[PDB]
Design a protein around this ligand. Structure first.
Ligand SMILES: [Ca+2]
Ligand SMILES: [Ca+2]
Ligand code: NA
Length: 259
């Protein structure tokens, strides 16, 4: 127990495909109660006095927080404070989603409820997002180098070029007709600096909405990336290194996360 941010028992793959060691509750942020974003839902651990890193997550174009509810709960149950935003407008673009992730992280750190701040290490924050929300995750990673990690899920953006040192794991869906991996996920991955720890995983046969319902692969890779970088939890390298996963139809890395 030398790593002060290490939470929960030694992981196994099967444990990372279900809700984790911590009971979770939600707090609903009303649209009117906050500026810079449209409110959302915070998933956070209960039955514990411990603190955890925080994650701000963005849904995609025309979607709301409930499109990632399963994943907010899944991540929180593994030992995170997870804020899934609603946008000011369902029709906000990827850069507007980055700004709203920025406002959500500031909110988490500065004016979230006492119940949430007691479970939060506001020094250890990360971002994730679906589609345009994934585009927003890449934009904010370029702007804020204190972010511990970025996980764009079936991401979409017109900008194909991001400069960040924030470790990025991108999830592509093989059969994605909305944000095709050849035009979105893969160029994002390839155009990221060669010196940035980066991973691309492609889900065999998966559609653009794979992230919107429970998905064993998204669970394993998202928990593992957030554990490794938000908590410095090297016990999660085993799921990100030497990867032989039949759910995947592509895998690319520059191998800066295994040592
Ligand atoms: Ca608002
Ligand atoms: Ca660019
Ligand atoms: Na920011």
């Amino acid at each position: 127990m030398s790593n002060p941010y290490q939470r929960g028992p030694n992981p196994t793959r099967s444990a990372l495909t279900a809700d984790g060691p911590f009971s979770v509750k939600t707090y609903t942020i009303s649209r009117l109660s906050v500026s810079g974003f449209g409110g959302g839902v915070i998933y956070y651990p209960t039955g514990t006095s411990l603190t955890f890193g925080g994650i701000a997550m963005s849904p995609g174009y025309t979607a709301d927080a409930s499109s990632l509810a399963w994943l907010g709960r899944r991540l929180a149950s593994h030992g995170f404070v997870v804020l899934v935003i609603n946008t000011n407008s369902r029709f906000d673009g990827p850069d507007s989603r980055a700004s709203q992730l920025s406002a959500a992280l500031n909110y988490l750190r500065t004016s979230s409820p006492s119940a949430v701040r007691a479970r939060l290490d506001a020094n250890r924050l990360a971002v994730a997002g679906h589609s345009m929300g994934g585009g927003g995750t890449l934009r904010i990673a370029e702007q804020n180098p204190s972010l511990k990690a970025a996980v764009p899920l079936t991401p979409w953006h017109t900008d194909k070029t991001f400069n960040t040192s924030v470790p990025v794991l991108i999830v592509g869906a093989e059969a994605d007709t909305v944000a095709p991996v050849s035009q979105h996920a893969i160029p994002f991955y390839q155009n990221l600096p060669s010196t940035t720890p980066k991973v691309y995983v492609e889900l065999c046969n998966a559609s653009h909405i794979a992230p919107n319902s429970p998905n064993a692969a998204i669970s394993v890779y998202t928990i593992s990336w957030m554990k490794l970088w938000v908590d410095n939890d090297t016990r999660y390298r085993q799921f990100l290194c030497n990867v032989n996963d039949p759910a995947l139809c592509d895998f690319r890395t520059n191998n800066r996360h295994c040592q």
